[PDB]
């Protein structure tokens, strides 16, 4: 089949039009290896999406593939017992590897992983409320928590990465807070921002939980936590089994040991092959030079993209960790147009602007993507001058602050609107009808 034939069959039977077809490049991948993907007609592309961050080492990494296929073929996949030898070896490796990890439990998705983290924190502390910043998954309570404010029906207060807000919330009602769960954003904030968050939480005896489902292997080889941010729980997911479905919740012994009373479970949590894969992933990441080489390829790409944009006079900001750097542009139309055009030149750029190199990249792969980016940017600017300021200026502070709010719900201003939101939210929590709680297990009533 070709692209058109497959999408018409897909529209009839499985595809969500925007999520699966129109929001994505007009190709469907047939096979992929290392940094390179091949579509249904044999066209080749360098992937800069990391399979939407699922992949960290590269496609069909042979050590991961060997580990998973050996488990599937020589032992089995999902057994009548929930414990397995690879589960215990993986748990031991992760507990040795991570300062916060005293025990670790597993699941299939990051959405379920962060749900487990919140469920365990509530079960361990017996407290109702959770303070949240960042995407944690597609459940309603997670999505609503990305917006600043309190939802009494879920017991979640979004605080928009705002440290003034977090401090005032903990002072006003910290005794009701089971946990603070934060997806680290490290373009607009530095590590000290999260160190201060963690310290604030400890001051109030409130578990601090890092949702590293995205950052776990791209902020560094041991995530933001490993760069020196203390935490009581860390959730991992994207990259953990290099594309195979696995997530992990690791943290303080008493929080993890709330598993029984919490009622968490799941048929496939015990699934063994992806645990063998993750063990292989850790071994690769801890091989001398491998992660450093990956970051060097990310820097080569970021530096090249920054200079192409600046050379076109396009106001831009390219920054963040080498394996998850953001390309911030003056408006939300220019990037998508450039990235759509670059698909014609053999690259899958990440259309949201966070580019994701993998460990399989070499200089040739990076330079192929840079050549495509230069030609695509040139074509878009020549064809659509209105799309792009080309005067050589810098991004306005207004654009940078607006982008933070739009992109991840970050409330970075100290203005009248933001402070009014803080006041409104604290008053709504403190003044609420305490007889009305979310449904919790175990009950807190």
Ligand X SMILES: *Cc1c(COP(=O)(O)O)cnc(C)c1O
Annotated binding site for pyridoxal 5'-phosphate: 110-111, 267
Q: Which is nearer to a second copy, 14 or 391 (CB)?
A: 14
Q: How many residues bind ligand X (CB under 6 A)?
A: 17
Q: Which is nearer to ligand X, 107 or 252 (CB)?
A: 107
> Could you tell me the strand order of the sheet in which 208-212 lies?
103-107, 247-251, 233-236, 208-212, 177-182, 129-133, 156-158, 149-151
71 part of the interface to ligand X, by CB under 6 A: no
Query: Smallest distance from the beta carbon of 213 to ligand X, in angstroms?
Result: 4
259 part of the interface to ligand X, by CB under 6 A: no
Paired residues of 354 in beta bridges? 326
Query: Smallest distance from the beta carbon of 49 to a second copy, in angstroms?
Result: 5
Q: Which is nearer to ligand X, 36 or 214 (CB)?
A: 214
Paired residues of 251 in beta bridges? 103, 233
Binding mask 170-189 for ligand X (x = CB under 6 A): -------------x------
Q: CA torsion, points 118, 124, 127, 130, in degrees to nearest 10?
A: -20
- What is d(CA 131, CA 137) in angstroms, rounded to the nearest whole number? 15
Residue 47: which of ligand X, a second copy, none does it interact with, CB under 5 to 8 A by kind?
a second copy
Of 193-252, binders to ligand X (CB under 6 A) are 211, 213-214, 237-238
Residue 437: which of ligand X, a second copy, none does it interact with, CB under 5 to 8 A by kind?
a second copy
Residue 183: which of ligand X, a second copy, none does it interact with, CB under 5 to 8 A by kind?
ligand X
Tell me the pairing of strands 129-133 and 149-151.
unpaired
Residues with Cβ < 8 Å from 121, sequence gap 6 or more? 130, 178, 179, 181, 207, 209, 233, 255
SS3 of residue 47 by DSSP: strand
Of the candidate spans 74-82, 90-98, 260-268, 371-379, the one that interacts with ligand X by CB under 6 A turns out to be 260-268
Which of 3, 65, 257, 266 touches ligand X (CB under 6 A)? 266
Query: Smallest distance from the beta carbon of 113 to ligand X, in angstroms?
Result: 7
137 part of the interface to ligand X, by CB under 6 A: yes
Of 6-25, binders to ligand X (CB under 6 A) are none
Q: What is the DSSP letter of 34?
A: B
- What is d(CA 389, CA 391) in angstroms, rounded to the nearest whole number? 6
Residue 396: which of a second copy, ligand X, none does it interact with, CB under 5 to 8 A by kind?
none
Residue 135: which of ligand X, a second copy, none does it interact with, CB under 5 to 8 A by kind?
ligand X
Residue 29: which of a second copy, ligand X, none does it interact with, CB under 5 to 8 A by kind?
a second copy
Query: Smallest distance from the beta carbon of 81 to ligand X, in angstroms?
Result: 16
Place of tokens 């990259």: 239
Query: Smallest distance from the beta carbon of 265 to ligand X, in angstroms?
Result: 6
Query: Smallest distance from the beta carbon of 131 to ligand X, in angstroms?
Result: 16
Q: Which is nearer to a second copy, 123 or 387 (CB)?
A: 123
Residue 136: which of a second copy, ligand X, none does it interact with, CB under 5 to 8 A by kind?
ligand X
Paired residues of 157 in beta bridges? 131, 150
Tell me the pairing of strands 247-251 and 29-33.
unpaired
**What length is written for the chain?**
445
Residues with Cβ < 8 Å from 289, sequence gap 6 or more? none
What does residue 424 show for φ and ψ, rounded to 5 degrees?
-60, -40
What does residue 347 show for φ and ψ, rounded to 5 degrees?
-140, 145
Pick the closest to residue 325 from 302, 350, 349 (CA basis). Answer: 302
Q: Which is nearer to a second copy, 202 or 440 (CB)?
A: 440
268 part of the interface to ligand X, by CB under 6 A: yes
Residues with Cβ < 8 Å from 163, sequence gap 6 or more? 193, 196, 197, 200
- Burial letters for 22-36: b for 16+ Cβ neighbours within 10 Å, e otherwise? eeebebbbeebebbb
Which of 61, 87, 136, 244 touches ligand X (CB under 6 A)? 136
Residue 445: which of a second copy, ligand X, none does it interact with, CB under 5 to 8 A by kind?
none
Tell me the pairing of strands 44-47 and 347-348.
parallel
Which of 109, 152, 352, 419 touches ligand X (CB under 6 A)? 109
- What is d(CA 299, CA 361) in angstroms, rounded to the nearest whole number? 12
Query: Smallest distance from the beta carbon of 241 to a second copy, in angstroms?
Result: 9
Q: Where are the alpha helices (DSSP H) in 286-362?
A: 290-311, 334-343
313 part of the interface to ligand X, by CB under 6 A: no
Query: Smallest distance from the beta carbon of 5 to ligand X, in angstroms?
Result: 28
Q: Which residues bind ligand X (CB under 6 A)?
A: 109-111, 114, 134-137, 183, 211, 213-214, 237-238, 266-268
């Amino acid at each position: 089949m070709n692209y058109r034939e497959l999408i018409e069959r897909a529209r009839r039977t499985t595809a969500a039009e925007e999520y699966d077809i129109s929001g994505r490049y007009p190709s469907v991948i047939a096979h992929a290896e290392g940094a390179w993907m091949t579509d249904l007609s044999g066209n080749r592309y360098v992937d800069l999406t990391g399979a939407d961050a699922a992949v960290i080492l590269g496609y069909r990494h042979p050590a991961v593939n060997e580990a998973i296929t050996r488990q599937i073929r020589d032992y089995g996949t999902t057994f009548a017992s929930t414990l397995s030898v690879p589960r215990v070896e993986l748990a031991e490796r992760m507990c040795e590897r991570y300062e916060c990890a005293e025990k670790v439990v597993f699941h299939k998705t990051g959405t379920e992983g962060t749900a487990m983290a919140v469920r365990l924190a509530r079960a361990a502390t017996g407290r109702e409320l959770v303070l949240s910043s960042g995407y944690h998954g597609w459940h309603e309570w997670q999505m609503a928590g990305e917006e600043f404010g309190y939802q009494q029906s879920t017991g979640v207060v979004g605080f928009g990465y705002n440290e003034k807000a977090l401090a005032k919330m903990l002072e006003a009602f910290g005794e009701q807070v089971a946990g603070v769960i934060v997806s680290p954003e490290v373009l607009y904030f530095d590590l000290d921002h999260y160190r201060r968050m963690s310290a604030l939480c400890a001051r109030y005896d409130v578990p601090f939980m890092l949702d590293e489902v995205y950052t776990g292997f791209r902020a560094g080889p041991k995530g933001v936590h490993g760069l020196g941010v203390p935490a009581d729980v860390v959730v991992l997911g994207k990259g953990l089994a290099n594309g195979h479905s696995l997530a992990a919740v690791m943290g303080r012994r008493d929080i993890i040991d709330a598993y029984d009373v919490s009622g968490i479970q799941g048929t496939y949590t015990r699934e063994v092959p992806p645990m063998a894969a993750a063990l292989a992933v850790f071994e690769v990441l801890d091989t001398p030079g491998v992660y450093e080489h990956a970051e060097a390829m990310g820097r080569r790409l970021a530096d090249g993209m920054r200079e192409i944009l600046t050379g076109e006079g396009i106001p831009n900001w390219v920054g963040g960790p080498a394996l998850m750097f953001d390309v911030v542009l003056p408006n939300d139309d220019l990037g998508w147009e450039i990235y759509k055009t670059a698909h014609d030149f053999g690259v899958y750029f990440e259309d949201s602007g966070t580019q994701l190199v993998t460990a399989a990249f070499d200089e040739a792969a990076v330079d192929h993507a840079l050549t495509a980016f230069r030609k695509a940017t040139r074509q878009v600017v020549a064809d659509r001058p209105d799309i792009a300021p080309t005067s050589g200026g810098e991004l306005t502070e207004e654009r940078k602050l607006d982008f933070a709010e739009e992109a991840f719900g970050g409330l970075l201003r100290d203005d009248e609107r933001t402070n009014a939101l803080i006041d409104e939210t604290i008053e709504k929590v403190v003044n609420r009808d305490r007889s009305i709680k979310p449904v919790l297990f175990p009950a807190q009533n």
